[PDB]
C-alpha cells in the first residue's frame, strides 16, 4: 500500500521539478548584470540601550517607529523610547524563559513566550494598573519559537512541536492549526496583506500558509539546514531566509524556486536573523560572528558590515519607515544603526 | 512649550522609578543562582527532584543552602529534540546530567551509549563551551547488584573493559566488591575521556557517585557551584 503512495509522491515531485526547471531560462543574477553597483555602505551606532541583565532574544519595532520591545532571560519585558532612550515600562514575567516577543499593530497589547509553551498577552492600556496579564494562550506542546499579531484579537504563534496555530485572544481557543513540517518551526513572517504568512522550520525548507484556509500553498527546499529566520520582500511576492548553512537564499512565490544565493568562502557561520530594508535593495542578516552584513538583494555582494557587538546577534529589526536598524545581541545591549 | 516639558519631566520620573525597581531586581538576580537538570528519561531525576522538594514545558524547584538560594529547572513537555532549545542554558551556573548506571523486553534499548553520545554532543556545543557540567552517576546500587549477579552489560557492550585496569587514584569505600569498583570507575573514565579531550580549558566536569535517595546530593551541588564560581573569579583576575 505504501509503495503505491510513495511512488505517486515521487512522480509528483519530479513533475514539479520539471515544471520549475523548464521555467529557468534566465536567472536574476544574469539579467541584473547591468544594474549599477550599490557601493560600500557605512553605518554608525546612534543609540545604545542598557538595563537588561541577561541575554536578549527577540525585539519588535512599534508601528510608530518610536517604541521598542525587548525580551531577556532575566524576566523583564522592557518597552523603550528609541528617541529619548528612556524606559517606559518594565513588565516582570512569571517565566524567565522567553524566546520571542511581539508588539501589536495598534500598540494596545504585547506578547511573549518561550520554553514555558504558553504565550502571555500583556495589556499596556489598562485604566489604572500600569501593566497586567490578559490571557494565556495555552495549548502548544513545545517551546514557542515565534509569534506575530494580525489584529488586536488574533495572533499567529509558532512552536517547536512542528505546529503553528491561530489563536482568538478573546476566547483563547485555536481558531486554525498549521501542520506539515517534519521538524521544529523556528520563525514566522506576516505578509504585507496579512492574509498569507510563511514559516521556516528545521526541515531545510520553508512553507507558505493561508490564515483564512489554514492549508499550505507552496513548499521551498533551497536551503540545506535549519531555517533560523524568514522575512517577506516588501512587495510581498518574495521572501528571504537565514539558515545554519551560512547562505541566504531569495525565493519568489510566483517563480516557485530560489532566485539568488548569498554566501562567501570566508563566511561559514550560521545566520541568526534576516530583515529587509524599506526599498528591499539591501539585505540585513545577523551572524554568529557578532556582526551583521549588508548584502545586495540584486547583486548579491556585501555592501557593509555592522560590527560592535560583543556576543551573538540574537535578533535584527528594521523600522516600518526603514530609517533605523535595531540589533539585539546576547550581550544584553541593544544598538541602533543608521 | 509646557505641553512638551511636562511630558518630558513625567517620562524622566517614570524612567527613574523603573531604574530603581530594576536596580533592586538586579540585586535579587545576582543573589540568585540558576541550575539546569538534564538526563535520560528513565534516570532518577524525578526522585531527586521529589526529595529536594522536602502539562507545562518547564518546572521550578528552589532550594536554599547556607542562606544562598539555588534555582533548578527541569525540562517539562518538550520535543525530544534538544539541539535548538538547549542553547538557552549557556549562562546557567552548572548542568546536572544525571545518568543511570544500571548495567542490565526489559532491555528495550541501551541508553548508556546514548547518554555518552548526548554528553559528548553537549560538551562540543559551541554556546555551551563555558557551562560546566556536574555528572551524577546515579543508580550505583543497581550497578553493584548486576555486577554481583554476573550478568552486567559492561563486559559485553564495552569490549575495552577486558583490558581496563582500576586506576591507582581510585578511592573505593571499604566493603565494596572489587568488580563493582572497577565497573563504576570504568564508567567514570569513559565520561572523563569524552570530557578531557577538548584541552581548551574552558570546560570542567565533576563526576559524582550518588543515589537518588542520598541526602548529600544537595550539598554536592552547593560545593560544585562554590568551586565553579571560585574558578570564575580566579579567571577574572587573570589568576588563571
Amino acid at each position: 500500500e505504501l509503495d503505491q503512495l510513495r511512488q505517486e509522491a515521487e512522480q509528483l515531485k519530479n513533475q514539479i521539478r520539471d515544471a520549475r526547471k523548464a521555467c529557468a531560462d534566465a536567472t536574476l543574477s544574469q539579467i541584473t548584470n547591468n544594474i549599477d553597483p550599490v557601493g560600500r555602505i557605512q553605518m554608525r551606532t546612534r543609540r545604545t540601550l542598557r538595563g537588561h541583565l541577561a541575554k536578549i532574544y527577540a525585539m519588535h519595532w512599534g508601528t510608530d517607529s518610536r517604541l521598542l520591545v525587548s525580551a531577556s532571560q532575566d524576566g523583564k519585558l522592557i518597552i523603550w523610547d528609541s528617541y529619548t532612550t528612556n524606559k517606559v515600562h518594565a513588565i516582570p514575567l512569571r517565566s524567565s524563559w522567553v524566546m520571542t516577543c511581539a508588539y501589536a499593530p495598534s500598540g494596545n497589547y504585547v506578547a511573549c513566550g518561550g520554553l514555558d509553551n504558553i504565550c502571555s498577552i500583556y495589556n499596556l492600556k489598562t485604566r489604572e494598573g500600569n501593566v497586567r496579564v490578559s490571557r494565556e494562550l495555552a495549548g502548544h506542546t513545545g517551546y514557542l519559537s515565534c509569534c506575530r499579531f494580525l489584529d488586536d484579537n488574533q495572533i499567529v504563534t509558532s512552536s517547536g512541536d512542528t505546529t503553528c496555530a491561530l489563536w482568538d485572544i478573546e476566547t483563547g481557543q485555536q481558531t486554525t492549526t498549521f501542520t506539515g513540517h517534519t521538524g521544529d518551526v523556528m520563525s514566522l513572517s506576516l505578509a504585507p496583506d496579512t492574509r498569507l504568512f510563511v514559516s521556516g522550520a528545521c526541515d531545510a525548507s520553508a512553507k507558505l500558509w493561508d490564515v483564512r484556509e489554514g492549508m499550505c500553498r507552496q513548499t521551498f527546499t533551497g536551503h540545506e539546514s535549519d531555517i533560523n529566520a524568514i522575512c517577506f520582500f516588501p512587495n510581498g511576492n518574495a521572501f528571504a531566509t537565514g539558515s545554519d548553512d551560512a547562505t541566504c537564499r531569495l525565493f519568489d512565490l510566483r517563480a516557485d524556486q530560489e532566485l539568488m544565493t548569498y554566501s562567501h568562502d570566508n563566511i561559514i557561520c550560521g545566520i541568526t536573523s534576516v530583515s529587509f530594508s524599506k526599498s528591499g535593495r539591501l539585505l540585513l542578516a545577523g551572524y554568529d560572528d557578532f556582526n551583521c552584513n549588508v548584502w545586495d538583494a540584486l547583486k548579491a555582494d556585501r555592501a557593509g558590515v555592522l560590527a560592535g557587538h560583543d556576543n551573538r546577534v540574537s535578533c535584527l529589526g528594521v523600522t516600518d519607515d526603514g530609517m533605523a536598524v535595531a540589533t539585539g545581541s546576547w550581550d544584553s545591549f541593544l544598538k541602533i544603526w543608521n | 512649550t509646557e505641553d512638551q516639558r511636562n511630558e518630558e519631566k513625567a517620562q524622566r520620573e517614570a524612567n527613574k522609578k523603573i531604574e530603581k525597581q530594576l536596580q533592586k531586581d538586579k540585586q535579587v538576580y545576582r543573589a540568585t543562582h540558576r541550575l539546569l537538570l538534564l538526563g535520560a528519561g528513565e534516570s532518577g531525576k524525578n526522585t531527586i527532584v521529589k526529595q529536594m522538594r522536602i502539562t507545562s514545558g518547564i518546572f521550578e524547584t528552589k532550594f536554599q543552602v547556607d542562606k544562598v538560594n539555588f534555582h533548578m529547572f527541569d525540562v517539562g513537555a518538550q520535543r525530544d529534540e534538544r539541539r535548538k532549545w538547549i542553547q538557552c542554558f549557556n549562562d546557567v551556573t552548572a548542568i546536572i546530567f544525571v545518568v543511570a548506571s544500571s548495567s542490565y523486553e526489559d532491555n528495550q534499548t541501551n541508553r548508556l551509549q546514548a547518554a555518552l553520545k548526548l554528553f559528548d554532543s553537549i560538551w562540543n556545543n559551541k554556546w555551551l563551551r563555558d557551562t560546566s557540567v556536574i555528572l551524577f552517576l546515579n543508580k550505583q546500587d543497581l550497578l553493584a547488584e548486576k555486577v554481583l549477579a554476573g550478568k552486567s552489560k559492561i563486559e559485553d557492550y564495552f569490549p575495552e573493559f577486558a583490558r581496563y585496569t582500576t586506576p591507582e587514584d581510585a578511592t573505593p569505600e571499604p566493603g565494596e566488591d572489587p568488580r563493582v569498583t572497577r565497573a563504576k570507575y570504568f564508567i567514570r573514565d569513559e565520561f572523563l575521556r569524552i570530557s578531557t579531550a577538548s584541552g581548551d580549558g574552558r570546560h570542567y566536569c565533576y563526576p559524582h557517585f550518588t543515589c537518588a535517595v542520598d541526602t548529600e546530593n544537595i550539598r554536592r551541588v552547593f560545593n560544585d557551584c562554590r568551586d565553579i564560581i571560585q574558578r570564575m573569579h580566579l579567571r577574572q583576575y587573570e589568576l588563571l
Partner: nanobody, 128 residues
Framework: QVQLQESGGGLVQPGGSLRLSCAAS????????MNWVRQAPGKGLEWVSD????????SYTGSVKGRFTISRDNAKNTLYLQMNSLKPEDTAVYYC?????????????????????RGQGTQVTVSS
C-alpha cells in the same frame, strides 16, 4: 534538497558479509559529518558508527566494533558500511544519517521522531 539513498540489504546466513552503501546527494558531502543508524524490530533507534569530514577519525559502538567498517568517498560522494561476520542479533533496518550543521563535531541524529536529515534506510536480516 537533502536526499539520502541507502543501498543493499537482504537475508543472509549468520556470519555472512554484507556491503551497504549511501549515495548521498544534493548537498556538500565533504562539509558534513556522517553517521550510521539502525533500529532492531520492536526497539528504538540506536547509533552504529560515525565518520568525520575527511575520515581521519572513526568510531564504532562496542557491540559492532571491529565487525563493521565505515568509509566515505568524496569524489564519488557516497558512504559505505562493510559488514563482516554478521550475527543474528545484528538484524535491523539501517539508516544513513547526517547531523544538521556543517563544520561541527556534535551530531544529533539519534532522534526517535521523524528526523529531517536521515534516509529511508534498508532492511538487513540475519537468520539461520
Amino acid at each position: 534538497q537533502v536526499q539520502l539513498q541507502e543501498s543493499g540489504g537482504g537475508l543472509v546466513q549468520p556470519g555472512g558479509s554484507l556491503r551497504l552503501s549511501c549515495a548521498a546527494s544534493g548537498f556538500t558531502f565533504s562539509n558534513y559529518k556522517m553517521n550510521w543508524v539502525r533500529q532492531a524490530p520492536g526497539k528504538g533507534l540506536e547509533w552504529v558508527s560515525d565518520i568525520s569530514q575527511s575520515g581521519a577519525s572513526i568510531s564504532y559502538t562496542g557491540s559492532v566494533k571491529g565487525r563493521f567498517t565505515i568509509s566515505r568517498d568524496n569524489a564519488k560522494n557516497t558512504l559505505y558500511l562493510q559488514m563482516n561476520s554478521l550475527k543474528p542479533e545484528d538484524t535491523a533496518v539501517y539508516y544513513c544519517a547526517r547531523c544538521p550543521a556543517p563544520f561541527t563535531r556534535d551530531c544529533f541524529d539519534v532522534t526517535s521522531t521523524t528526523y529531517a536529515y536521515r534516509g529511508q534506510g534498508t532492511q538487513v536480516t540475519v537468520s539461520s
